[PDB]
RNA sequence: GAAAGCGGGGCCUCACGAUCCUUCUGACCUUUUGGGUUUUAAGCAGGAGGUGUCAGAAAAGUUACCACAGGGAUAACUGGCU
RNA sequence: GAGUGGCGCGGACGCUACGCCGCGACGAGUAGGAGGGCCGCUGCGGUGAGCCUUGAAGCCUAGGGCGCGGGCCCGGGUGGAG
RNA sequence: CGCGUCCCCCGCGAGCGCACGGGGUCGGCGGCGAUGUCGGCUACCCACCCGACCCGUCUUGAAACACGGACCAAGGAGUCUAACACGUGCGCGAGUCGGGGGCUACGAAAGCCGCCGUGGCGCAAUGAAGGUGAAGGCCGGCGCCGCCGGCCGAGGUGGGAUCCCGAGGCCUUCCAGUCCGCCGAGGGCGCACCACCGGCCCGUCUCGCCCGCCGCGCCGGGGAGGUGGAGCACGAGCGCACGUG
RNA sequence: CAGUAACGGCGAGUGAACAGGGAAGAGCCCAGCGCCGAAUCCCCGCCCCGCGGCGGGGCGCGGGAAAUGUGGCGUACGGAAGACCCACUCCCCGGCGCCGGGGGGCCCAAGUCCUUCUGAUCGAGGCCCAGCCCGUGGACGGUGUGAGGCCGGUAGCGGCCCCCGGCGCGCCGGGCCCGGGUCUUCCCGGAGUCGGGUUGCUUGGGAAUGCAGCCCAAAGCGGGUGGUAAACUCCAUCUAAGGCUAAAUACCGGCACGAGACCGAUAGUCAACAAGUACCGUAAGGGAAAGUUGAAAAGAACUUUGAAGAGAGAGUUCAAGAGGGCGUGAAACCGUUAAGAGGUAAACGGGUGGGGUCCGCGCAGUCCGCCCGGAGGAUUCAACCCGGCGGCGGGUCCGGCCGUGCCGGCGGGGCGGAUCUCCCGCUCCCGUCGGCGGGGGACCGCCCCCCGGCCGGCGACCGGCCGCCGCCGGGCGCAUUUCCACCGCG
């Protein structure tokens, strides 16, 4: 939309909206991020600190599916099933725990953010935080390993 | 969904359970009074004091 | 040069890019010389499947995938030999062959054998000379009754197992899975040493 | 909704335009210097048209 | 120092220096990429090597053969104030 | 405010609510910023049962007017298809 | 300027009219009228009084003995693409999005897929790293246990738009009085948000004491007190479109 | 994936790959090792069919190539020979007869109907109570404006004649006479090349990713790779230094088409025209300007002045106020006609006055209610019958339909659910518990529908009989009523 834009009523107007003392000339202060540590420091140090430097080691060939591992928390971790088997999980006398395969559902670790609705539940996940786990005990579950 | 589901503000506006829950209008307009000088014009002189 | 607080930007644009720009206005001709020439080969190929040949079932690598399946390229020499197919019939009569996978399970390999068996079952075989059958053909009922199959053969679904609700053992509760995570860590990573030590000892 | 989906949706049935890439460009031009009285543009490299 | 206390440099106001690279020091430290042992290398933390144009380019002249962009923001004339 | 006891067939305008109305104070302005344009140009989707050889665009004009202005609308002439 | 009644001393008359009264009216008049006069501001020409230096631009300062401009017509200068940020409109919402692919004149459009969400961005951070990865008191048994258990359980303070209760009260010649509607003394629940104090997660330091076992070890886990983080503390994101930088 | 791992005066900047989802999908062959009497190939001469891709057959003590290795078998997925089981008759290239992709040419609906405007119609109005006619055709172009119907075309899984392809039955020519499963017995491979040292370039590739020069130069339970230099050691993964190969991809050149929210002759290509032209440069090279009379030339016979260019009359045309570089005809600037003015260069803002130019189509001057005052006219009100239509409420009638409503039914199904469990598959122990995967069947959820009852509605969604009011039409009424037009200086 070129009728709603500001070009279109600076027509008259002399300098076109860029001042008549400092004009609009083409590259005044470089190109880019050009005077990094010489004439634009402060805007650099104020703004974007740490920029310049060296830190840690260089992992030269890094495929990213080796660090592979999406969580889950005790929050959202009764979703990945229906709410027919916690229902029914109560609804049955017998104690069954339904089981909970996390990574069905496309987790493989599970963290601890989460309180817990008071039902056993056996957790087939690949890896465990500690406060996760004790959280599950204290529920009074289990905690089976995937490989 | 709708965002209002009855959109008559014709019948909802004189409808009895909002008209009770209502002030009454002031419906009178006052336009500006000329100042008229009481010290010159006996009757305003009187009108105030 | 920079105003205020904004992100420091650095735009791949340096070189004569203007000249290198490819811009899409083939797009929907594209699609419709693919959609022609797809129908084109599936009304060649006639009565035989529109996507070709059967793809066999396979594992993706890396730790990230190994829980998916895929199809694979072709079935490899040693599922033949125990599905009892010869190589050089095997894509004569419809069937991706691979001479480079290997089979380090037997399960991804019993998984193929029984694909090849079903597959073998469905296949309904034309005489080589259409008035006089030979004894490896199927009969003139199925042979009438044949026809074009759409989409991919025998297609590769993803399905995974149904656990029902188990009352929770005393030592199930019991097994301390974070400790046993932490402590085969430090026996992967120290065990090196432990051995060179004991040697030394 | 209909004007604003009616506005974005009608913008995909339009065959592009352009101008030449080569035009304006395809002379041998140059500045004839500051002095010379003239208005110091580039000016069409000199002969007898 | 008997003790109250006083002392983490000079009675006080000055005496000094970033990224990169190097060099040393520290832990029974992490990593060296398919697994292990060992040199090596890379890391993490703290000092030093120095930028005196001292918030820190690596740097000699000449042009009367000279050239371009500008400047009355700036000299060589008049004119003005003194 | 509300309950139980002690003849004549009449009544202006209004309220495009994105409208209409009432009262009070205020109004310099370069660079610059924002808003409102029933200011103007050229093309596309809708719409005006639009205009037009009984004369479209364009152009000229001591003609008649509107608008704070950008501009615009009628009269007369020329012109010949939008 | 009525008495029928409330003290210390000596509740509705009726009219008519004039107006220094919430902004001007006349129920007053008089001329002149068809090719010679009436109106017509603006607009053509002229005269007179007052005012009045030539625009643009850089400049502390331009009418300048500063530069550009003889005159006229047509052309003629903040655009498009990618990136980012913030505001704004729309759709869905712990999601969101087919953009690449496939299916069945206008139309190279529109429609559809979900076992086409691969994937992108989001829902988790911190460490160079290996890695680790987001709330608890009390009540018994084992003035104490590493725990066996049992009940309940996402903080506190101050300010906070609204909401809630209601000491009393809102009339017609009274007295009780019943129902709705309404005002309000004072007293409570407290949204978002702000300030403060707690707390939890990751890194790192100081001090110390207990627990575990298919693998008793330079094994693994735990506690208290500061401290570094682009954190948690019952989500706001994604896609599209527009605006300014 | 990803502006990521990485490179970078670690500054400015630069910057891939694997995995994953698709588009497409296709695989193979030598040398070597070996066995088959060189079993192989090229060419001349004669004959026959018969080949605008020079090919098949017969014939020759015709000639050559080749053991310094041609062909058959055969290649890392193993191969070959010998023994025992097992079972086949059909692959391939070239003539034909017939039906069932493209290039060419010729064609196929309906108004020039009746009045009317114009120079000319394609405009305007009309065309049965059979909405002019056709319409699988209402794209576009031409035609004296503007045309579905005048013409070419357009539509059509429309017609006709030619010509060149593609495939299958089978007649018919030629060749080839060929399989697999298991043991025993042999065999197995590319060297100035890998590799290392150094040098230069290159890379995202960092103690060196790729390429190259020179020097050194291998091995065979080897060699290569395993993103940090090196030694020892397990493990994984390929088989380098020989070769061929479709499809999916790219395309401002070329031949042909179709389109556009693009430009409309100072624009758009430099080029709408005798444009890469004229012209310029010794040359390499540079490189313009330039569209439009009119529907139709009907392009001005003839008279007349002049040496002629040029005029003056006639004449054609709707028009020369369109006259051959001629549609429209702006401004600058110039000529002339009219008006006014004029010694402070002109021009300018404010305020008037004077004169023009046209305009009000000026010049006896506003209409509007009701009433009163006179006078005319009309078949005329109020009421009451008969009909049709509408409104509301019928506070709460009778019957219907709906529900981002709800409660029932032993009412009859669709999807769904990470809710549960009877038949069949393969195999394991020997018809055979139990294992295995895929179908069925119970249960929960939402939904669709049939019967039942409330609650809401019908104002985003209704009828019929009542009742009242209102309207319209026709009777009836017929004048102190009602209603029209005209005067009164009301």
Not at chain 1, 98 to 117: E, F, N
Not at chain 3, 105 to 128: D, G, H, I, W
Not at chain 3, 174 to 192: D, E, H, I, T
Not at chain 4, 10 to 15: E, V
């Amino acid at each position: 939309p070129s009728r709603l834009r500001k070009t279109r009523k600076l027509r008259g107007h002399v300098s076109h909206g860029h001042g008549r003392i400092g004009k609009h000339r083409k590259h005044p202060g470089g190109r880019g991020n050009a005077g990094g540590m010489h004439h634009h420091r402060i805007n650099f140090d104020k703004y974007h600190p740490g920029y310049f430097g060296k830190v840690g080691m260089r992992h030269y060939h890094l495929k990213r599916n080796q660090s592979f591992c999406p969580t889950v928390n005790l929050d959202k971790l009764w979703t990945l099933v229906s709410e027919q088997t916690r229902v029914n999980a109560a609804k049955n006398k017998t104690g069954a725990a339904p089981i909970i395969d996390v990574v069905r559902s496309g987790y493989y670790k599970v963290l601890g953010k989460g309180k817990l609705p008071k039902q056993p539940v056996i957790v087939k996940a690949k890896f465990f935080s500690r406060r996760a786990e004790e959280k599950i005990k204290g529920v009074g579950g289990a905690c089976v390993l995937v490989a | 969904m709708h965002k209002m589901l009855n959109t008559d503000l014709s019948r909802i506006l004189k409808s009895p359970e909002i008209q009770r829950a209502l002030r009454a209008p002031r419906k009178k307009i006052h336009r500006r009074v000329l100042k008229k000088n009481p010290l010159k014009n006996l009757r305003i002189m009187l009108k105030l004091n | 040069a920079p105003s205020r607080n904004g992100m420091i930007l650095k735009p791949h644009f340096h070189k004569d890019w203007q000249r290198r720009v490819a811009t899409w206005f083939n797009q929907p001709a594209r699609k419709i010389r693919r959609r022609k020439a797809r129908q084109a080969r599936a009304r060649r190929i006639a009565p035989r499947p529109a996507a070709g040949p059967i793809r066999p079932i396979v594992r993706c690598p890396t730790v990230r995938y190994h829980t998916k399946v895929r199809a694979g390229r072709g079935f490899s020499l040693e599922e033949l030999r125990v599905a009892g197919i010869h190589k050089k019939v095997a894509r004569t009569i419809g069937i991706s062959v691979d001479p480079r996978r290997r089979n380090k399970s037997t399960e991804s390999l019993q998984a193929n054998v029984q694909r090849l068996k079903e597959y073998r079952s469905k296949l309904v075989l034309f005489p080589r000379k259409p008035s006089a059958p030979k004894k490896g053909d199927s009969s003139a009922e199925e042979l009438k009754l044949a026809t074009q199959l759409t989409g991919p053969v025998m297609p590769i679904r993803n399905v995974f197992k149904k656990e029902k609700a188990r009352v929770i053992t005393e030592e199930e509760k019991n097994f301390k899975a974070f400790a046993s995570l932490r402590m085969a860590r430090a026996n992967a990573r120290l065990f090196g040493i432990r051995a060179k030590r004991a040697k030394e000892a | 909704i209909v004007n604003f989906v009616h506005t974005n949706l009608r913008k995909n049935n339009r065959q592009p335009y352009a101008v030449s890439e080569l035009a304006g460009h395809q002379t041998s031009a140059e500045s004839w210097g500051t002095g010379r009285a003239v208005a110091r543009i580039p000016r069409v490299r000199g002969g007898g048209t």
